């Protein structure tokens, strides 16, 4: 199937004999030549360590929240460590977080008990999920839970952290309620402090070291990320390499992680705008982080490949046609002696004739090729 | 008022004041262990 263009035409046609004509066999896309990675240069070391290693984190209802910016996003060091019993990131995977790099990070920590770890997840129902903290049904982030018996739990009752046993309504995602106001049920007659069907919504948690796994201190830190439209300030420990211009390349500009060729851009970006887009919402520009310049991401050259041959009954000689590609970037065919260029594309294997004849194999753009002495 | 059940059983008896906690599920005592024992999976309301 890939010995030569005639073999490819035979395979695609599913026949050992190929009639005279032009048959599309494959698509020729110029493969990337190298890899380039650019983002802000070693801005600062991230305090991610202080998120998990801090002495204390707040309760479930009044959960703390730290914001990560001007950081190095060293993620997989946390994944590799075996101390983290639960690391089921729902929106993403923790082994590839260093590859990408995001606009901002929220590292909010709240200690729930044991089996209630599964209660926090996109689209879950329970006590914590309804009354203390609900994660959005469309969640893109990690959940980093581990046993924390050695510090949080204490004998005789660890009542530091609390939770809302009764709430009048459900919880909107990422909403923190610290009202702690007495709630009435049934006929709601308790306008005072204490009354029938009237009790404090916050009953203290109980953690004892003599407790089972399902009812154990399980400290949880759930990182959250947002899609990259604004410039990204937290990006992982990746090696930055020199960019290339006018050369097709795999690029990772601030997490774009796409392929293409970077021509010079005559469009002027206003200083606040970072990224670019086309009429049809595809990336068509990018501001390189290190050097604040604009370089249009025109796509890597591609186009159909058509084998232009007479019948196998006539001859086994073929002439390929790289459609819509300038002949310079074709080599990235064995018969390189003669190369022709036309609006249809690089026509390799056929030699131009100044004379004109009736069309036999229609190439396109008003030129037709035939097999002739 | 928003839940439905196949059947409901009403069990009436007389106990003194301090024996009310015995009728509470997951409790021990003379009344709970020898007079009227309740399942730990009890789904209902106790009235006194």
């Amino acid at each position, epitope marked *: 199937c890939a010995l030569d263009p005639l073999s490819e035409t035979k395979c695609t046609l599913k026949s050992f004999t190929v009639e005279k004509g032009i048959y599309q066999t494959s698509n020729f896309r110029v493969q990337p030549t190298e890899s380039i990675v650019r983002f802000p240069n070693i801005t600062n070391l991230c305090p991610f360590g202080e998120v998990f290693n801090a002495t204390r984190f707040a309760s479930v209802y009044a959960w703390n929240r730290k914001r990560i910016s001007n950081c190095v996003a060293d993620y997989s060091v946390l994944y590799n460590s075996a*101390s983290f019993s639960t690391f089921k990131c729902y929106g993403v995977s923790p082994t590839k977080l260093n590859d990408l790099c995001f606009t901002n990070v929220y590292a909010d920590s709240f200690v729930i008990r*044991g*089996d209630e770890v599964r209660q926090i997840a996109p689209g879950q129902t329970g006590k914590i999920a309804d009354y203390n903290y609900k994660l959005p049904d469309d969640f893109t982030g990690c959940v980093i839970a581990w*046993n924390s*018996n*050695n*510090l949080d739990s*204490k*004998v*005789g009752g660890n009542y530091n952290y609390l939770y809302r046993l009764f709430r009048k309504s459900n919880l909107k995602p990422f909403e923190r309620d610290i009202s702690t106001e007495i709630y009435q049920a049934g006929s709601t007659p308790c306008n005072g402090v204490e009354g029938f069907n009237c009790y404090f919504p916050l009953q203290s948690y109980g953690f*004892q*070291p*003599t*407790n*089972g*796994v*399902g*009812y154990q201190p399980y400290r949880v830190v759930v990182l959250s990320f947002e899609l990259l439209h604004a410039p990204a300030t937290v990006c992982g420990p990746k090696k930055s390499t020199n960019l290339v211009k006018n050369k097709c390349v795999n690029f990772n500009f601030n997490g774009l992680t796409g392929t293409g060729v970077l021509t010079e851009s005559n469009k002027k970006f206003l200083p606040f705008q970072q990224f670019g887009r086309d009429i049809a919402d595809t990336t068509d520009a990018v501001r390189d982080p290190q050097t604040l310049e604009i370089l249009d991401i025109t796509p890597c050259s591609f186009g159909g490949v058509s084998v232009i041959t007479p019948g196998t009954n006539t001859s086994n000689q073929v002439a390929v046609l790289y459609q819509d590609v300038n002949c310079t970037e074709v080599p990235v065919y064995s018969t390189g002696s003669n190369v022709f260029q036309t609006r249809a594309g690089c026509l390799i294997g056929a030699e131009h004739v100044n004379n004109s004849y009736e069309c036999d194999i229609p190439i396109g753009a008003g030129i037709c090729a035939s097999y002739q002495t | 008022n928003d839940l439905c059940f196949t059947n409901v059983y009403a069990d009436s008896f007389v106990i003194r004041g301090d024996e009310v906690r015995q009728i509470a599920p*997951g409790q*021990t005592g003379k009344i709970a262990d020898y007079n009227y024992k309740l399942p*730990d999976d009890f789904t209902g309301c106790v009235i006194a």
Partner: antibody
Amino acid sequence: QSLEESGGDLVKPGASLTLTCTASGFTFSRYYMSWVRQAPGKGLQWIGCIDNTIDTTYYASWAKGRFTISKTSSTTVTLQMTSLSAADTATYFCARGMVVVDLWGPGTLVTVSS
Amino acid sequence: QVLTQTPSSVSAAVGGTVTINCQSSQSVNNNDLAWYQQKPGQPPKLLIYFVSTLPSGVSSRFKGSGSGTQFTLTISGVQCDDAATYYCQGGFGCNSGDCTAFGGGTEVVVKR
């Protein structure tokens, strides 16, 4: 909050025996539990433990397959023994917790003799 | 998996400080060491858990040091009522070296 054991008696070697510790004031569905033995002239060693989700799997290596632990109901946990030997004589305490324990029962001795 | 109580026997005075060493063959699981004082004829009572954290309702005389493989207990003083064997309860990353283990006894005598 108290625990009490039962089932200690003289039993010939090679015969099965049932032990049981009962929880008073609390149910064996929130607080961790463990099963331990102490020979009269030897150190203390643990055999089995189960609470909350199925946790019976954790057994002592020397205990092997002749040791099993199961909770018949919420407040009572029973211990089943097989292949009794003279080296199995010890005092049986119902521990409360895997790595950390608060309080145990008085302990029922199970002597094995023929 | 067996934890060694070195020395097996320890002798100390009422006003004399008490130290003991409990070594674990393998690394413990996330600082899960415990210590219980076993008075004769009665199950042991908790004195120190998670190496150094003090339980509620115990005297302020027991302090623990060490982590990983080596750990130690230090007691400031004895009121003659702490004559009991101490067992260092070694929690392990379970399914490796059993699931947890108990060491040998270490009783403290007071000379009067």
